[PDB]
Design a protein around this ligand. Structure first.
Ligand SMILES: NC(=O)C1=CN([C@@H]2O[C@H](COP(=O)(O)OP(=O)(O)OC[C@H]3O[C@@H](n4cnc5c(N)ncnc54)[C@H](OP(=O)(O)O)[C@@H]3O)[C@@H](O)[C@H]2O)C=CC1
Ligand code: SF4
Ligand code: SF4
Ligand code: SF4
Lengths: 156, 80, 208, 114, 53, 176, 287
């Protein structure tokens, strides 16, 4: 099946192209923002993995929900999420974001962020030490490596 | 063309335009608070609806003290 | 006693005692209590009428400067007919001393809007209006700070429970975020930790 | 037993302020449905406004009526500006049922609420 | 701190310098433009974990 | 004692004012800033090659939430609920039953890794040191179900290694 | 029945309701809204999917913490589908594409798919199997789609006889095919009688029929209140949008009534007409 061979190789090529750079947007409310800045630090690079910190939600590949999400914040967070280009992926960073965390039993704190957006990679820690976030971004890249998108477009 | 019965007729059909009144039932001493079964809520709705229709502000103590459509016409002839 | 215990300085104790006795004897119109703690920080307990004269007297008069204003919190106490407590905190730049102006207040009758004499109390009054319900009379702008807009209930009260009455979630039916009545994921066990046997004999209040 | 009132002496000024606030909310709604781009006609919004006014229609303490005037005026300010977004104005409505009825029988099949 | 005689604090409260600094934003930016407003937000170290209490 | 900045005056000697005007017209200290930045250009970069060179750590890192057990023995825990009492997030959830051996034991021991703020209070509160903040911090969880650990996930997490945790505790049983 | 299957307390968001529902399809439109109403009800929904997990990722978090479950299936193996519906209370068949693929015609999807899954569900022993069809899908001509839906109705009524056959009219919502198709056109003008019905009334009818008892066997048909000309509807679409072969034959066939079998009045829900919800959904015109 030379057509299936071509579709498999071309899907491998375009999924490599997708997982190559993956420039995020740094949403970053509380101290998890400081830790995102500290994995933007000179010791732990991001440019080695093609990752560039960038304040442009009009072109951002993945979105890193980090910090304590509140009721006064969450419509603005999803309104940022909605003006995002449709191939989109979500990293929930931090105990506050991945299930409520320390301010769980509390008004004006959304219990997690599944109540707002879907989540692809949970990375726990408080703050998740930058090596753990970087391993989470590697597992996100390998999630992009396992997609079989064009194969499903073939055999659909 | 500042005719008093023209004011009467235009008040009558904007009360017709108000849909929560049954019937229209134009009178000189109608008293649509208690003789027609309405709240002061609908009273102030009708008063500032007349304000919406043809002009001046018609303040709130006067809205407390109109109570009757012919007296609204006489109040407009007093004020306008 | 001599190690492991913070000593107290009776010089400052006598000085703050004499100063509080001075202030209490020269403003008889609004003073009820001047209490001195063991650690020598003054507390002045005040009827809710002379807020503006006591603050204008305590900003000036050159026997006590106290130009610096800090926090205001009205900590909510039931089993009092007048519940809430306005706690002004005043700091002198020249003297290095701290006086806690506690005036009492109820649920509804306003205290007299200290923003006119201390400009640092603007967001303090707005914030304590949002969180408690202590109204301030003839204040410029009263809005909601540190809550959601559509939220109400004055949540730092004791009648408002720990978990709120709302719970947001996104849904795709109406394509937006909506609020439902609260559904916990765990009970929040409020443990019983009040142990008996009277650890402090010096604070035994006289019973009935 | 001396209490400083907020705004009013007797219920007359209380009624005057609350009907003034209702007049403002009546002339404030179509601006909101034109600005926030809501999804509900003018009649239904005005009916739930008059419903929320008719809900607390039996309170006679003038301090409490003045304080509800202050509450409604704060919400009228924050809705006549563009601060409160689409979520809060839809949150005033209840279209996300919760169809929980007030029978005895349907309250009996879904129990523990007498 | 406000402490009833117990093992629990009855009521804490926090006076925040970021809140006190941000209170005077009008009297810092009465006569400038928006880039200078970003400079004013810079020159007082806001973090808003603390400015919120 | 104080040391305040910016109290001078620009000089009236012609040499000083023409040096300042030369700085103004001639972009001088801008070029000196370029020289400083090129002096940091020619350093060697202090980046660690991440998946091959992992970062430095401590003997007492607070990680993985792995239980321990006795030397050639059974489970170390008791279900004495001290960790659940001290847990500030209240993420610990314990249900105890005793078994046929007579000694007291458990049934259910759940840690909400979502809620866990990673303090060390349950490490320092266990009287037998059963629950230990583990060594490594590599969780990276796709679903939301998998961040809710059972007793068996904790025991497999503590039987995939103890010699690491034993080495850490044998390193620093003297401070805590 | 075992415990933790009965309902508990209030409704939804970890308030455990009664049903355990396995939904086939559930990647597109109506399955998405039905999964949303079952997550509002607070049940456990087994959704299997054959496509890429990005789509079920975008419709993922509508259920609560780990309530809904994702699994895998195909249109070829009975054993994977039997593995999917091993343990379930109810199962709904919502599958079907409105064009032929390279690998599947309208043949064997409406033909092979409900026979196989209804066979293995009857071999599993579940209740209240609810199968969708379209309104007025008879044996007669002009549509392979409609005649294969007639064959599928005959299949689901033939085997597993206590299956709830359900059929709506042309249904519109936020991601409709025909109403957005009328929006995204260019043109021609003809006559046809037709009724639409807004999607939340249909799916509230489905959830009330699936949790209210003893309504099995009796096939249902959902009736909109308006029931007027297609050409007036298309002029209404151009008016609200401010701008003055298989699918076009399937919309120019007809829509006639079958009034013998009931609708929403034996179920107790408001049917919302076109005006309100159509002004709601018709955004995205000029400016
Ligand atoms: N006018 C209307 O819209 C009406 C529609 N209906 C019915 O409602 C249902 C949903 O409508 P619609 O908007 O079109 O949503 P879909 O067409 O997306 O729903 C069909 C489902 O079947 C899946 N599917 C597609 N091809 C195959 C295949 N070859 N084998 C197995 N599964 C397949 C789809 O994608 P995936 O594989 O990703 O799961 C999807 O989950 C349809 O079954 C339709 O017949 C009924 C009456 C009126
Ligand atoms: S998870 Fe921890 S580090 Fe992150 S925002 Fe919350 S408190 Fe800060
Ligand atoms: S403190 Fe230690 S022994 Fe006690 S319940 Fe917790 S892990 Fe078990
Ligand atoms: S580290 Fe803290 S939050 Fe985590 S389980 Fe231990 S005591 Fe609880």
């Amino acid at each position: 099946s030379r057509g299936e061979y071509v579709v498999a190789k071309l899907d491998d090529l375009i999924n490599w192209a997708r997982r190559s750079s993956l420039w995020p947007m740094t949403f970053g409310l509380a101290c998890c923002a400081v830790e995102m800045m500290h994995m933007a630090a000179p010791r732990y690079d991001m440019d080695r993995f093609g990752v560039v910190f960038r304040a442009s939600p009009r072109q951002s590949d993945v979105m890193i929900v980090a910090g304590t999400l509140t009721n006064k914040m969450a419509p603005a967070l999803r309104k940022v999420y909605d003006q995002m280009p449709e191939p989109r992926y979500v990293v929930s960073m931090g105990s506050c974001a991945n299930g409520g965390g320390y301010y769980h039993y509390s008004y004006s704190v959304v219990r997690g962020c599944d109540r707002i957006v879907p989540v692809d990679i949970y990375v726990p820690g408080c703050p998740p030490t930058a090596e753990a976030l970087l391993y989470g971004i590697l597992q996100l890249q390998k999630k992009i490596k396992r997609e079989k998108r064009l194969r499903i477009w073939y055999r659909r | 063309p500042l005719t008093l019965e023209g004011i009467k007729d235009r008040v009558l059909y904007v009360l017709k335009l108000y849909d929560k009144i049954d019937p229209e039932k134009l009178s000189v001493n109608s008293h649509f608070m208690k003789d027609l079964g309405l709240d002061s809520l609908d009273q102030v709705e009708i008063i500032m609806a007349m304000e919406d229709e043809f002009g001046f502000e018609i303040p709130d103590i006067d809205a407390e003290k109109l109570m009757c459509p012919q007296e609204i016409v006489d109040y407009i002839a007093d004020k306008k | 006693t001599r190690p492991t215990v913070r000593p107290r300085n009776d010089v400052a104790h006598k000085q703050l005692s004499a100063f509080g006795e001075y202030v209490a004897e020269i403003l008889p119109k609004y003073v009820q209590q001047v209490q001195v703690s063991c650690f020598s920080e003054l507390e002045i307990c005040i009827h809710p009428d002379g807020v503006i004269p006591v603050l204008t007297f305590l900003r000036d008069h050159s026997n006590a400067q106290f130009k610096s204003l800090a926090d205001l919190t009205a900590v909510d106490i039931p089993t009092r007919q007048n519940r809430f407590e306005i706690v002004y905190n005043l700091l002198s730049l020249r003297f290095n001393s701290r006086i806690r102006v506690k005036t009492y207040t109820d649920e509804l009758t306003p205290v007299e809007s200290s923003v006119s004499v201390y400009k640092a109390a603007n967001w303090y009054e707005r914030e304590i209006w949002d969180m408690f319900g202590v109204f301030f009379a003839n204040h410029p702008d009263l809005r909601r700070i540190l809550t959601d807009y559509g939220f109400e209930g004055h949540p730092f009260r004791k009648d408002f429970p720990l978990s709120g009455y709302v719970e947001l979630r996104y849904d795709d039916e109406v394509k937006r975020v909506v609020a439902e009545p609260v559904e916990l994921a765990q009970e929040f066990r409020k443990f019983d930790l009040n142990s008996p046997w009277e650890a402090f004999p010096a604070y035994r209040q006289p019973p009935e | 037993t001396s209490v400083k009132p907020i705004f009013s002496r007797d219920m007359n000024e209380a009624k005057r302020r609350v009907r003034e606030l209702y007049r403002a909310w009546y002339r404030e709604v179509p601006n909101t449905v034109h600005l926030f781009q809501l999804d509900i006609s003018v009649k239904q919004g005005r009916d739930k406004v008059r419903e929320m006014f008719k809900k607390n229609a039996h309170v006679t303490d003038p301090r409490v009526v003045d304080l509800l005037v202050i509450k409604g005026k704060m919400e009228l300010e924050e809705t006549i500006n563009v601060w409160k977004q689409r979520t809060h104005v839809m949150r005033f409505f209840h279209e996300t049922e919760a169809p929980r009825p007030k029978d005895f029988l349907s309250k009996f099949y879904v129990g523990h609420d007498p | 701190l406000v402490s009833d005689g117990s093992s629990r604090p009855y009521r804490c409260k926090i006076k925040a310098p970021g809140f006190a600094h941000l209170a005077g934003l009008d009297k810092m930016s009465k006569g400038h433009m928006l880039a200078d407003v970003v400079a004013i937000i810079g020159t007082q170290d806001i973090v808003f974990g603390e400015v919120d209490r | 004692t104080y040391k305040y900045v910016n109290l001078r005056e620009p000089s009236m000697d012609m040499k000083s004012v023409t040096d300042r005007a030369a700085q103004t017209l001639l972009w001088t200290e801008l070029i000196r800033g370029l020289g400083m930045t090129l002096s940091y250009l020619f350093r060697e970069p202090a980046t660690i090659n991440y998946p091959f060179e992992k970062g430095p750590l401590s003997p007492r890192f607070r990680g993985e939430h792995a239980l321990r057990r006795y030397p050639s023995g059974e489970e170390r825990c008791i279900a004495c609920k001290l960790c659940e009492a001290v847990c500030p997030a209240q993420a610990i959830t314990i249900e105890a039953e005793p078994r046929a051996d007579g000694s007291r034991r458990t049934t259910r021991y759940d840690i909400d890794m979502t809620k866990c703020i990673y303090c060390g209070f349950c490490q320092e509160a266990c009287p037998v040191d059963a629950i230990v903040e583990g060594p490594n911090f590599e969780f990276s969880t796709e679903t939301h179900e998998e961040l809710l650990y059972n007793k068996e996930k904790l025991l497999n997490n503590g039987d995939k290694w103890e010699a690491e945790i034993a080495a850490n505790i044998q390193a620093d049983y003297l401070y805590r | 029945l075992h415990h933790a299957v009965i309902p508990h307390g209030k409704g939804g968001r970890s308030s455990v309701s009664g049903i355990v529902a396995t939904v086939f399809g559930a990647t597109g439109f109506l399955g998405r809204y039905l999964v949303n109403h079952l997550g509002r009800m607070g049940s456990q929904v087994i959704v299997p999917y054959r496509c890429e997990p990005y789509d079920t990722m975008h419709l993922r978090p509508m259920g609560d913490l780990g309530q809904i479950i994702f699994m895998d299936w195909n249109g070829r193996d009975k054993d994977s589908i039997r593995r999917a519906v091993e343990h379930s209370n109810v199962v709904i068949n919502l599958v079907g594409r409105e064009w032929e693929t390279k690998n599947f015609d309208f043949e064997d999807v409406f033909v092979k798919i409900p026979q196989a899954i209804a066979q293995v569900s009857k071999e599993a022993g579940v209740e209240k199997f609810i199968h969708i069809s379209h309104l007025n899908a008879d044996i007669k001509s002009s549509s392979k789609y409609l005649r294969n839906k007639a064959v599928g109705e005959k299949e689901v009524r033939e085997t597993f006889p206590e299956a709830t056959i359900i059929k709506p009219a042309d249904i519109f919502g936020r991601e409709d095919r025909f109403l957005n198709y009328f929006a995204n056109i260019r043109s021609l003008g003809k006559k046809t009688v037709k009724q639409p019905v807004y999607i939340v009334d249909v799916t509230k009818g489905i959830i009330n029929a699936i949790k209210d008892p003893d309504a099995r066997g009796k096939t249902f048909a959902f009736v909109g209140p308006n029931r007027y000309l297609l050409f007036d509807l298309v002029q209404y679409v151009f008016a609200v949008a401010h701008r003055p072969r298989d699918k076009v034959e399937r919309i120019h066939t007809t829509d006639r009534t079958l009034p013998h079998l009931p609708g929403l009045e034996d179920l107790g829900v408001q049917a919302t007409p076109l005006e309100l919800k159509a002004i709601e959904v018709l955004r995205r015109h000029r400016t």
